[model samples]
Target chain A: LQAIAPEVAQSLAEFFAVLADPNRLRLLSLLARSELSVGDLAQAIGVSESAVSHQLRSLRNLRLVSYRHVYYQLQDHHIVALYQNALDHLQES
Target chain B: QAIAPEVAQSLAEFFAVLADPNRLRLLSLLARSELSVGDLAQAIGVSESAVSHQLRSLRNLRLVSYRKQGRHVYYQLQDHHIVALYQNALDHLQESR
Candidate 1:
């Protein structure tokens, strides 16, 4: 496992902020299962398509989630690794 | 020796669990003190059922643990690990941006 670096801590903060909304969270959770279109996400989360699109815009800006035309997917392990690495800090305390 | 891919997948699942504002707030509040589901709901301004639902998800992910006191259940961050992890992220955010 990579040791948590100060930069990793920085990224994880921005990373968590990406997840700081219920709509975006639901979008990512759905994507974790499989890539989905914005239309699919809005229906699944019971939000409007515009609302989902706006949330996806924020998530994409943070690089927490990525989209391919109509479909969106969560970014790979690098992001999660940063979170896992920072999580190691609590082990000692 | 090496960590297995399954372990890596588990970590991803853990982050997936932590990826909600409600759950994040729940973790932050619980980091301060253990509280019942109702208390957490009121604190976060969500539906009681929604809070309970997220608490169950947090519990399943091992991010939180709970105790029963009669009809009420008190939920808390699983360990210093979770609290430290969140604060580390918070501190990092403050410093970086």
Candidate 2:
């Protein structure tokens, strides 16, 4: 394997740590499909809007998701791929 | 956004599975090239049993697949998307640094 800087690995570990949560992963799944407001995500995931908003703050800080005009979506294609690939892996045997 | 609850649970479980340091290192190694258990053990500097145990989890997750070749079990990533995810994580980490 190519050598990774310690900082890089640690950062990546933190990135996965953010994703390691059930609610956050569900939030990613929702965002991956389309943009949604915090209320929408909260409704879909069966969590309170406050809880969804709180997690979105963490995701935004990590650059995993982005918001515009009260609607949150995946930040970019990297996140899109990460979310989809993770979902695909789950469905695989 | 209309995902089944069971699907969400499975997806979360998948993420949890990859959240381990050893498994991530094993994945990073496998991302570079296919390797036997011994090669993986040596490269990661972990015990062969440790590597094997993680490989089994990875295999069960279907994130990795292996083939038996003349008394050797060679393992590689099961899908290109996994490599993309791994590379994307590395790129995201480096870019944000």
Candidate 3:
């Protein structure tokens, strides 16, 4: 097995950082199903595009998601793996 | 959503960053792509110094990286995996709401 690099550990920390918000969490959920523009995400999440744009900055900083012209895509290995992990935890309970 | 015990412990720290509304907002903007400190501050309606301070904290944790373009420093997401991780949690939260 490979040793967990400091960068990987740091990455994990960054991963959780993005999840710290209910709204941002909601943003991620919406983006996961399909890519949406700032306007779409703002309306879906019930916030202004400016607010959504602001939150997107933090999410972007943490590498939680990436965007193109108008659509944002879900990225992050830990999110995919951890969501399954979290899902399993929920299922087991 | 429930998290694994160990994962929860670690994730708790990650949650620490999001504890602030400003930081939360900051992450959202960065999701789009690289942004300068001034641009982020302007978008978020905060002082540039304030934004830079928060960015510093995030940078310290390796959550973001920066590149210099003349006088401006641009910041961006460090990886795709991290993006997915947050999105997963975000989805879980939305479903519960």
Candidate 4:
């Protein structure tokens, strides 16, 4: 493994910390497949719209996900990889 | 997005477990190469006991597995997905810098 600076590790940890919650992961996966409005995510994940919006705010702050006029999607391709990799890892026994 | 609730929970739990600093450090090392417990301890500069403790936790999470030969046990990452996660996270970190 390539050595990363401590700051990098902490930043990476913060990114992972953002993903440590179930609601956030659900929102991330939903967004990973396609962009969605807060309402769409709330309904899909069975959570309050405010709850989805709140987590989206956190995700955006960490740059893990991004928002447009009214839809949210993963911030970039790296996020797509992170989300999919975690999903694949979980699927494995 | 439309994943099963149980699956979502499992994924969350996995990430939460992996969020630890020590675990991440060990994983970063393992990503480059597999190592014996003593080698890991020396590389990470942590005690053998602490490395052993975390190794057990990693094993329990199925994030890592070991091979035994004679009296030596070598540990390795369970799969490429883990390397992808760690590398992507590192990439994101560097990009943000």
Top-DockQ candidate index:
4
TM-score of each: 0.54, 0.87, 0.47, 0.91
Q: Deviation in angstroms for B10 in model 2?
A: 1.0
Candidate numbers, best lDDT first, in rank order: 4, 2, 1, 3
DockQ of each: 0.07, 0.55, 0.08, 0.64
Tens digit per residue, CA lDDT, model 2, A17-58: 778766677788788889999898888888787788899988
Q: Which digits, one per residue and each the tens of the lDDT, describe model 2 over residues B1-97?
A: 5567677677766666676677777788888888898998888777999999888878776878898999999999888878987888777666743
- Model 1 chain B lowest lDDT segment of ten: B1-10
**Which segments of candidate 1 are over 4 A away from where they belong?**
A1-93
Docking class of 4: medium
Ranking 1 against 4 by lDDT, winner = 4
Q: Residue A11 in candidate 3 has what lDDT?
A: 50
Best by lDDT: 4
Residue-level lDDT for B52 in candidate 4: 90
**Tens-digit per-residue lDDT, A15-85, candidate 4:** 67778777777777788789889899989888787788888887888888888727898888888998898
Ranking by TM-score: 4, 2, 1, 3
Model 4: residue B87 alpha-carbon error in angstroms? 0.5
Clashing pairs in 2: none
Scored against the true structure, residue B14 in model 1 reaches a CA lDDT of: 68
